[PDB]
Amino acid sequence: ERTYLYRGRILNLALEGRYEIVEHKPAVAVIALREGRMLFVRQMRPAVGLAPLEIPAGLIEPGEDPLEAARRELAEETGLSGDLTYLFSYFVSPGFTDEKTHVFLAENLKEVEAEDEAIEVVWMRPEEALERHQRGEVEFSATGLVGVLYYHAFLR
Amino acid sequence: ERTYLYRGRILNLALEGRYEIVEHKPAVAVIALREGRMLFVRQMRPAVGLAPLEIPAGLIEPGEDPLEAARRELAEETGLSGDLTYLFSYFVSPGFTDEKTHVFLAENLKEVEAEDEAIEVVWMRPEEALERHQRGEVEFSATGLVGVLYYHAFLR
Ligand SMILES: Nc1ncnc2c1ncn2[C@@H]1O[C@H](COP(=O)(O)OP(=O)(O)OC[C@H]2O[C@H](O)[C@H](O)[C@@H]2O)[C@@H](O)[C@H]1O
Ligand SMILES: Nc1ncnc2c1ncn2[C@@H]1O[C@H](COP(=O)(O)OP(=O)(O)OC[C@H]2O[C@H](O)[C@H](O)[C@@H]2O)[C@@H](O)[C@H]1O
Ligand SMILES: [Mn+2]
Ligand SMILES: [Mn+2]
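^ thats the input. predicted complex w/ AR6 below
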């Protein structure tokens, strides 16, 4: 038996025996390179009180599958569309939440819209994002770090 | 004002205006290679109902800093010690939680203990972990995927 303590907008909090469990919608994230720059985004994140370096990401909404959600959040956050390829998925923190992230690569990006304004588009070479992070200048989300590592592994 | 709905063992659930926020202890994770195999672990994770491929990881306990927590969970989960180097950190899912993970590299591993039994030690070439994941055979945690990508980027 899961017993629910809180049913919310973007999460539920449940107890399952001794375990505290946060149910959360699945997410998508998109890795995109153009002229050696990766497409990052930043927004104020009240949970952490700062704006980490992320890649375009969002929740999968009712009716959508991961590919469709990835297309949508790329367009809504950055005004771009591209050719999407599924890469891999991961559980963000499976010791307490079921949130799963599906990661895509985008190629051949084109502007379809001139976007959500509280999101800052940050094109940045991934080598520079990693250096800024090593020097303490920026924090990463998991999606931002996965983008930077994937680039270094496979896109040079 | 954060208003608290739940104060627990491994998380607190808070509201901050419209935002649902899960406070969570920071974590560590350790990337370790030996003879071309990466040190993964698996354990049943009730939040997800399965055992994803992770790397050795744990929460930072009172009094500890990340390096010390990394040493401890490597020994407790796998019976090993090594020379630790800090790599980078990431917020697991900063749209709802403040959990931050500090990732270390371990080299020169030695057995100090013959360990916590509900953790399965899984030495596996990272190329094979990535293939098994691409074929649907295993799920990744963020820490497992970060280990595999870091290897491919920097440890070949
Ligand atoms: N959902 C939970 N509810 C209550 N207690 C729990 C839960 N999960 C574990 N404990 C207790 O908490 C104690 C300390 O857990 P440690 O073993 O240092 O950590 P880790 O490997 O779980 O988590 C490490 C990271 O890996 C994953 O990505 C996680 O999501 C974290 O981000 C354990 O003894 C359990 O008794
Ligand atoms: N803590 C919250 N509480 C309540 N509502 C919120 C919260 N955060 C956002 N919303 C509402 O939820 C709506 C849908 O959010 P989308 O914009 O598709 O997602 P994302 O970028 O937030 O999260 C994407 C991933 O990136 C990060 O790693 C996250 O942790 C996720 O893993 C937003 O309109 C907000 O109005
Ligand atoms: Mn978003
Ligand atoms: Mn652990």
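Chain B touches chain A through 51 residues (CB under 8 Å).
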